[PDB]
Amino acid sequence: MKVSVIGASGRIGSAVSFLLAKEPYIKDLVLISREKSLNKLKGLKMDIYDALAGTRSDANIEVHSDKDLSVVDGSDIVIITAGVPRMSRLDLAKINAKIVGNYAREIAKVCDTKLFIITNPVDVMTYKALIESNYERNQVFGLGTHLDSLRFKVAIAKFFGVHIDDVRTRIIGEHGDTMVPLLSATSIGGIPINRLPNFENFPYEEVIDDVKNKGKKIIKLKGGSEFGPASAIINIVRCIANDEKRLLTLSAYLDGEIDGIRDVCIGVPVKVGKNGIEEVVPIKLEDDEFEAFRHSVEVVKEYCEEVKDI
Amino acid sequence: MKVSVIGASGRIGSAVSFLLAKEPYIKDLVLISREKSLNKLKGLKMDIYDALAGTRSDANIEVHSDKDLSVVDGSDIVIITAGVPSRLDLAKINAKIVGNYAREIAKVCDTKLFIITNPVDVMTYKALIESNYERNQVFGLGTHLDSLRFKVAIAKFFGVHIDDVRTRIIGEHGDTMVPLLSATSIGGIPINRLPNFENFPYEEVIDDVKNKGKKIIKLKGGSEFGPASAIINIVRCIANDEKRLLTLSAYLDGEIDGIRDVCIGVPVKVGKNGIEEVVPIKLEDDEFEAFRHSVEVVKEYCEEVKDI
Amino acid sequence: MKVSVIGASGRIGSAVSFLLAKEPYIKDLVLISREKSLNKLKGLKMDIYDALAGTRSDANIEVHSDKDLSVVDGSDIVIITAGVPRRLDLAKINAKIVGNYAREIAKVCDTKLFIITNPVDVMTYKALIESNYERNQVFGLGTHLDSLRFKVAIAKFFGVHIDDVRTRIIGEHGDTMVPLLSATSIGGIPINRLPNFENFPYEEVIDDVKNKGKKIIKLKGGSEFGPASAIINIVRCIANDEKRLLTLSAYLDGEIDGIRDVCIGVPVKVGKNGIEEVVPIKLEDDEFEAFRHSVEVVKEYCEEVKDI
Amino acid sequence: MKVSVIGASGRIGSAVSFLLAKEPYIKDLVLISREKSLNKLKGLKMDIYDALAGTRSDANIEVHSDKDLSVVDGSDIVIITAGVPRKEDMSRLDLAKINAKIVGNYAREIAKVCDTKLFIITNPVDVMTYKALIESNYERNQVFGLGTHLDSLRFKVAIAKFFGVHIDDVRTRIIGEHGDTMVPLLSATSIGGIPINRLPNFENFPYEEVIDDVKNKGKKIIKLKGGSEFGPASAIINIVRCIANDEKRLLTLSAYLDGEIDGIRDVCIGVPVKVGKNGIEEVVPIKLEDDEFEAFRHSVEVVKEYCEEVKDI
Ligand SMILES: NC(=O)C1=CN([C@@H]2O[C@H](COP(=O)(O)OP(=O)(O)OC[C@H]3O[C@@H](n4cnc5c(N)ncnc54)[C@H](OP(=O)(O)O)[C@@H]3O)[C@@H](O)[C@H]2O)C=CC1
Ligand SMILES: NC(=O)C1=CN([C@@H]2O[C@H](COP(=O)(O)OP(=O)(O)OC[C@H]3O[C@@H](n4cnc5c(N)ncnc54)[C@H](OP(=O)(O)O)[C@@H]3O)[C@@H](O)[C@H]2O)C=CC1
Ligand SMILES: NC(=O)C1=CN([C@@H]2O[C@H](COP(=O)(O)OP(=O)(O)OC[C@H]3O[C@@H](n4cnc5c(N)ncnc54)[C@H](OP(=O)(O)O)[C@@H]3O)[C@@H](O)[C@H]2O)C=CC1
Ligand SMILES: NC(=O)C1=CN([C@@H]2O[C@H](COP(=O)(O)OP(=O)(O)OC[C@H]3O[C@@H](n4cnc5c(N)ncnc54)[C@H](OP(=O)(O)O)[C@@H]3O)[C@@H](O)[C@H]2O)C=CC1
Ligand SMILES: [K+]
Ligand SMILES: [K+]
Ligand SMILES: [K+]
Ligand SMILES: [K+]
């Protein structure tokens, strides 16, 4: 497999590149940056190679500028982590829709691939990448409410005193304040947490608000999330690599699977495999959660229109 | 961690010895068998060693007989996979086997006993009584194996990676299972809230699970790799103190409806101290009743093999 | 990746199937046996599925007899473990088995043939000829396993992790082995330079490495976990195009001292396309002479089975 | 296992915390920082936790400051990545004097709390490891640094990218100082176990150029990206794994010598060390060639001079 990370010079880009080179199935890895940042990537290449030596891993890392994206040909996934530093949730959306749109257009002129969008707003940037690439919807997806579901997993596991991996929850909709945390998909060991001791003392609304404000807290404290997002990305790349056909949650295009909702890219239950988003699974939603998903689809559609012509 | 396997010459025993030797935490593995089978273990130690050479692993594998169980001293866990393949007959014969091994082990050291011998929910109770060990240290691999088989059948009907399925079965490792369809979820999403669940043949699936052990015994001769890997998950949770909610044959002292004096498959939080608590999950109505029925039948068998 | 295991009902074939399904790249695994063992395979498929559920792995296992080998088409690799277990007579018996299998596999598709049947060098040669496959596509697990056994012996005498040891044995998987002390290392450090090499019983250890197969057969009934894990390493090298310098039974076409028309254990670069290169390392005169003798006997046995 | 990373707010420290949290044997991870960097660690703990949610891992990350180091009590290892940024206007002696006080104060206060292993990453790593062993008054088997091992992995990268081989198939050793007095052991350099002198095309290996590159690779990574993080962090994890699972592996680390090599004593320098549950369990005295052994004597002499220069800091 060959994966090209556009934005490898950044925080998430560099972490994703190192974790990706370690991945056994990743043979070739193309690190793409703006020409000015290319030296930062040279030092990433060296650093990653050193880690590969101390990880019993190997990869052909390959550092290029963004000038000619023909270096991404043969790549099965092009992870776009490139984003301007932040200026509202709409303003950065116009700047980053410019960036992601140009990257998707040029990538599509060069080859056919799966575009993994990490730039924020991730649902709007995934929609912009799909629009400008003219790629089929199975090929363009963004890491969205999955990172939120991982932060939720942490909160639940720490409260219930279990290995973080034993918790498995799902949050759909916008990677933002209009999240739709599915408490019916929240379980420790496959057992719904409502049926577990002390769920009555679980501060769910506090925990969900904290989950919503965790990205901001990490920006304010360290300067931005890097390892959490990067690990979440390696999961998706591994699913695509080994055709694992897994029910995951990704920002993908809806075309009537869930309540006839179309013309948007939002967090949805999807079956990921070698062909990207193979199907948007229409999981049965409670009435209150389905309403919240409709609302997040409304806000995301408004934002998507504000950058459709960018 | 030092783990001793009693019955390593068997199907499950040899598979579990190879897998445990590969585990990084396992530093000392003590294989044990009847003297008449000790040579089969001497070969096993060799073959596993070569496997360790080709898996980047290392382990100090000692091979001994069951005549001096002092070799199990220092064993964090002792996995008893020893036993012969009439139900009350297998419970009585394997109860002599497991009870003797537990008594002798308890005279050597204070370890945790992982009973794999069948009837597992009864051999686990026999091990606990004949050891006098604290309840938290004796546990058995019961409904967990059945839950992995159910996991397979679901993951194939719904066309997902098996590991995206996560289910749970409680009660007896036997025809009185209590499968928790309310605790069956793909991606955390209950199957009841998933497309095509209507056409999921739950009843056929659970019946095939009930007899999958007998069908492997008929086709291959006995479950070897499935049971072994299931053992390694428990050994890992104990070694790394993962404090995970699993399902094991464990002693009940009233955590679930005052049910006591029974070792049965239950939700248990497992860590460095074996069974750390019997978590009383809120069961459904039909489920809790099939669980009291499984506790009833299992208590019958435990009585039938108490004077053994 | 799709791999077919021809001979999966066997001891080695079953361990190889369980480990191959557990691998993340193996998406399809086609287990093939004679009709008389097809049921044994359908319980292996079940048993492995149960392990895959307990190993967070998944795969699509397909069980078929050897009657119609069209079930192997699409395989990147076909691992032939089918073979009468254990001299020249065994070569003839298994040359018929391997020759017919390679003939019918080559009539079904073009694939890589990983040959485990013994005499592995001779059987790899017979597979190459009877399939008319390219020489980069046919290879066997030969002296690599001897090197892993030498690895165990060295690591134990020197008190180091088994994986810290790295040695090379070339030539035949047998009594014409050519152990290369010049390549035996610990941490990359040649063992001669290490402390206490003067006390290492090299000749006794190599004699033991040669007879280790015979001893595992006498004590347990045949090697399975060692050879299976070794096979996994080779399959993984192909599946990830690791381009690792390994030792495998491969066809020589003059890379080493103009030695040709033989499939013998040699240093090769394994990758996506199989034997990408036979690397002619600098062998001492003594080692090279032993390699020439080994090649001689292997060619004698290869001629004795040239029409079988 | 409980590992305390002092200096986790940095590049090496944060990378190492993330990897250690993922390690299955790490149950407690204590991240320590200056009081002005504690927020940078509370963001780190969160980020790593999210990573542990997406890596099927779990750990109890506790975030404290360097004021009270009674928080590291119970640690099997304390990895000190604390160090000053090497500004261009800083000599070797200047950074040695600056980081000798940092490492010495941390060693003294960590010893006042408990008895643990001190994994020194701060450069000059040999001199800092020596200062930490001295000011901790610990057993010499318990204090050890990451030195020529990283230079060895970089040599491995340069070898495996020249010979067209997987990186892990190359195994080489560099002993001596994590610096210009390095002693690369071409005797201990191999591919698949085959010494590389016995390999096709060793004639054209630019070994001397390669070694000068491996000697300046850290400086180049600093110039380009700002400092290595993943290389040293992964190497650190390898050492922690050998200690935790008692693998008894022959590694190369900065360790104290008490005569194992030609009566060379009173120096923490890069040497072959069998690492296990008890840190440096033996300094293995491998048979170095004459030129190699002279170069090692030289590296020891220079490192002893650096140590005398920071003996009273
Ligand atoms: N929803 C999710 O899952 C998450 C999404 N994110 C998003 O991912 C992005 C990456 O953030 P992060 O990497 O942490 O921060 P960085 O700012 O460190 O990454 C910025 C990267 O984007 C590149 N870049 C900046 N401006 C432009 C431009 N005008 N044109 C092209 N490339 C440009 C930078 O190159 P240079 O080196 O020249 O600056 C650098 O490669 C952010 O947009 C962030 O919002 C963040 C966390 C989680
Ligand atoms: N808990 C679970 O989910 C499962 C448990 N099992 C149970 O575990 C046991 C092992 O099954 P399996 O290994 O597959 O079958 P095997 O018969 O292949 O293994 C038998 C093993 O038990 C030992 N053994 C047999 N009889 C005695 C005896 N009288 N005293 C002491 N040791 C003895 C044997 O030693 P020797 O070779 O010397 O006879 C050998 O080690 C069975 O009781 C089986 O029912 C099996 C599968 C599922
Ligand atoms: N070089 C290596 O690394 C090693 C290679 N080996 C070799 O591999 C072979 C298998 O070893 P092992 O599995 O332990 O032996 P087993 O006897 O345990 O299994 C034999 C397997 O070979 C198949 N087989 C036997 N005879 C025939 C035949 N006439 N036609 C087709 N298939 C046949 C069997 O099918 P069925 O089940 O129907 O009988 C079964 O699949 C042996 O030849 C052995 O020498 C073994 C160890 C080390
Ligand atoms: N042994 C090897 O091969 C390698 C060694 N290193 C060495 O390890 C150290 C860390 O490198 P790196 O993390 O990349 O550099 P950074 O500057 O990125 O991080 C420096 C770290 O050291 C801490 N620190 C700085 N000054 C002091 C002080 N006076 N007292 C206590 N803590 C302090 C910082 O905390 P704050 O946030 O307050 O600044 C921060 O945690 C350096 O000394 C470097 O030379 C690095 C790589 C390889
Ligand atoms: K890789
Ligand atoms: K081990
Ligand atoms: K698989
Ligand atoms: K951990």
Query: Cβ(A39)–Cβ(A64) under 8 Å?
Result: no
B165-166, strands of its sheet edge to edge = B165-166, B185-186, B189-190
Q: Residue B166 is nearest to which of A162, A168, A246, comparing CB atoms?
A: A168
Q: Is the CB of D313 under 6 A from ligand 4?
A: no
Ramachandran sector of residue C188 (left: φ over 0; alpha: ψ -120 to 50; beta: rest): left
Q: Residue A27 is nearest to which of C24, C58, C240, comparing CB atoms?
A: C240
Q: Which chains touch B (3 or more CB pairs under 8 A)?
A: A, C, D
Joined together, the tokens standing for residue B179 give 């499968």
Joined together, the tokens standing for residue B119 give 């009837």
Query: Cβ(D275)–Cβ(D281) under 8 Å?
Result: yes
Residues of D in contact with B58 (CB under 8 A): 247-248
Helix (H/G/I), strand (E/B), else coil: A143: coil
Instruction: For residues C166 and C168, give the distance between their C-alpha atoms in angstroms, rounded to a whole number.
Output: 7
Joined together, the tokens standing for residue A192 give 């719904």
Under 8 Å CB pairs connecting chains A and D tally to 157
Phi then psi for residue B280, to 5 deg, are -85, 85
Taking alpha carbons only, the member of C33, C19, C41, C203 closest to residue C101 is: C33
Output the furthest CA–CA distance in chain B (Å, rounded): 57
Query: Cβ(B192)–Cβ(A279) under 8 Å?
Result: no
Query: Cβ(C101)–Cβ(C80) under 8 Å?
Result: yes
- In sequence order, which residues have a C-beta less than 8 Å from that of residue D46 and are 6 or more positions away? A151, A214, A217, A218, A221, A225, A228
Instruction: For residues B168 and B163, give the distance between their C-alpha atoms in angstroms, rounded to a whole number.
Output: 13
Joined together, the tokens standing for residue A196 give 């577990």
Q: Residue A247 is nearest to which of B180, B182, B187, comparing CB atoms?
A: B187
Instruction: For residues C244 and C250, give the distance between their C-alpha atoms in angstroms, rounded to a whole number.
Output: 15
Residue D241 CA to ligand 4 center (angstroms) comes to: 22
Q: Which residue of A has its CA nearest to C272?
A: A27
* Residue count (chain B): 308
- Mutation test of ligand 2: which of B116, B124, B177 has the most ligand atoms closer than 8 Å to its C-beta? B116
Cα torsion for B206, B212, B213, B216, to the nearest 10°? 180
Ligand of minimum distance to the alpha carbon of C53: 7
Buried b (16+ CB within 10 A) or exposed e, D43-67: bbbbbbbbbbbbbbbbbebbbbbbe
Q: Is the CB of B116 under 6 A from ligand 2?
A: yes
Chain D residues bordering chain B (beta-carbon distance below 8 Å): 24-25, 27, 58, 241, 245-248
Instruction: For residues A188 and A171, give the distance between their C-alpha atoms in angstroms, rounded to a whole number.
Output: 15
C-beta neighbour count of B306 within 10 angstroms:
13
Buried b (16+ CB within 10 A) or exposed e, A48-83: bbbbbbbbbbbbebbbbebeebebbeebbbbbbbbb
Taking alpha carbons only, the member of C11, C64, C35 closest to residue C216 is: C11
In whole angstroms, how far apart are CA D17 and each of A48, A104, B35, C196, D234?
17, 35, 49, 39, 11
Q: Residue A51 is nearest to which of D41, D168, D231, comparing CB atoms?
A: D231
The angle subtended at Cα A53 by Cα A52 and Cα A54, nearest 5°, is 90
Contact C280 D200 (CB under 8 A): yes
User: Which active-site residues of A does the annotation give?
Assistant: 175
Ligand of minimum distance to the alpha carbon of D55: 8
Residues of C in contact with B166 (CB under 8 A): none
- In sequence order, which residues have a C-beta less than 8 Å from that of residue D145 and are 6 or more positions away? D119, D120, D121, D125, D126, D128, D129, D132, D178, D253, D254, D268
Nearest chain B Cα distance for residue C132, angstroms: 31
Joined together, the tokens standing for residue C34 give 């004679």
The one-character DSSP state at D1 is -
Instruction: For residues C105 and C30, give the distance between their C-alpha atoms in angstroms, rounded to a whole number.
Output: 13
Evaluate whether the domain defined by D148-309 bears CATH number 3.30.420.40.
Answer: no
Q: Is the CB of B85 under 6 A from ligand 2?
A: yes
Residue D275 CA to ligand 6 center (angstroms) comes to: 16
Q: Residue D195 is nearest to which of C161, C182, C194, comparing CB atoms?
A: C182
- Domain C2-140: CATH superfamily is NAD(P)-binding Rossmann-like Domain (3.40.50.720)
Strands C112-115 vs C77-80: parallel, antiparallel or unpaired: parallel
Q: Is D178 a catalytic residue?
A: yes
Element (H, E) at C105: helix C88-106
Q: Which residue has the tokens 């010895």?
A: B17
Helix (H/G/I), strand (E/B), else coil: C269: strand
Joined together, the tokens standing for residue D152 give 């060895």
C-beta neighbour count of A93 within 10 angstroms:
23
Class of CATH domain A2-142: alpha beta
State the number of CA atoms in the 13 A half-sphere of A180 facing the CB: 28
- In sequence order, which residues have a C-beta less than 8 Å from that of residue A92 and are 6 or more positions away? A83, A84, A86, A120, A121
Taking alpha carbons only, the member of C75, C78, C68 closest to residue C6 is: C78
Q: Do domains A2-142 and A145-305 have the same CATH topology?
A: no
Taking alpha carbons only, the member of C170, C162, C180, C112 closest to residue C142 is: C170
Query: From 3.90.1150.10, 3.40.50.800, 3.30.110.60, 3.40.50.720, which CATH number describes the D2-145 domain?
Result: 3.40.50.720
User: At how many degrees (to 10) do helices D230-244 and A38-53 cross?
Assistant: 20
Residue A120 CA to ligand 1 center (angstroms) comes to: 8
Joined together, the tokens standing for residue B140 give 């058995």
C-beta neighbour count of C91 within 10 angstroms:
22
Taking alpha carbons only, the member of B148, B154, B274 closest to residue B204 is: B154
Distance of CA D46 to the CA centre of its chain: 26
Instruction: For residues D309 and D312, give the distance between their C-alpha atoms in angstroms, rounded to a whole number.
Output: 8
Taking alpha carbons only, the member of A231, A249, A225 closest to residue A141 is: A249
Chain C residues bordering chain A (beta-carbon distance below 8 Å): 24-25, 27, 58, 236, 240-243
Ligand of minimum distance to the alpha carbon of D23: 8
The H-assigned helical ranges of A88-183 are: 91-110, 122-133, 145-160
Element (H, E) at C178: strand C178-186
The one-character DSSP state at D176 is B
Q: For residue D138, with 0-12 CB atoms within 10 Å meaning exposed, 13-18 middle and 19 or more buried, which class applies?
A: buried
Distance of CA D203 to the CA centre of its chain: 32
Query: Cβ(B30)–Cβ(B2) under 8 Å?
Result: yes
Residue B52 CA to ligand 6 center (angstroms) comes to: 8
The angle subtended at Cα B13 by Cα B7 and Cα B19, nearest 5°, is 145
Class of CATH domain A145-305: alpha beta
Query: Cβ(A179)–Cβ(A249) under 8 Å?
Result: no
The one-character DSSP state at B83 is S
Q: Which residues lie with the beta carbon below 6 Å from any ligand 1 atom? A: A 7, 9-13, 33-34, 36-37, 40, 81-85, 96, 99, 118-120, 122, 143-144, 147, 175, 224-225, 229
Contact A58 C236 (CB under 8 A): no
Query: Cβ(C125)–Cβ(C139) under 8 Å?
Result: no
Residue B271 CA to ligand 8 center (angstroms) comes to: 14
Query: Cβ(B24)–Cβ(D245) under 8 Å?
Result: yes
| Neighbouring-strand partners of residue C28 | C2, C60
Phi then psi for residue B164, to 5 deg, are -75, -25
User: Which active-site residues of C does the annotation give?
Assistant: 173
Q: Where do the domains of chain A lie?
A: 2-142, 145-305
Query: Cβ(C111)–Cβ(C128) under 8 Å?
Result: no
Joined together, the tokens standing for residue D13 give 């420290």
Mutate to test the interface with A, among D50, D58, D148, D229 (most CBs of A within 10 A): D50
Nearest chain A Cα distance for residue B76, angstroms: 21
Taking alpha carbons only, the member of B296, B293, B292 closest to residue B257 is: B292
Classify the C-alpha dihedral C125-C130-C131-C132 as positive or negative.
positive
Element (H, E) at D117: strand D117-120
Instruction: For residues D24 and D240, give the distance between their C-alpha atoms in angstroms, rounded to a whole number.
Output: 12
Instruction: For residues C170 and C147, give the distance between their C-alpha atoms in angstroms, rounded to a whole number.
Output: 9
CATH of domain C143-304: 3.90.110.10
Instruction: For residues A242 and C64, give the distance between their C-alpha atoms in angstroms, rounded to a whole number.
Output: 24
Taking alpha carbons only, the member of D40, D79, D72 closest to residue D237 is: D79
Q: Which chains touch A (3 or more CB pairs under 8 A)?
A: B, C, D
Instruction: For residues C135 and C278, give the distance between their C-alpha atoms in angstroms, rounded to a whole number.
Output: 11
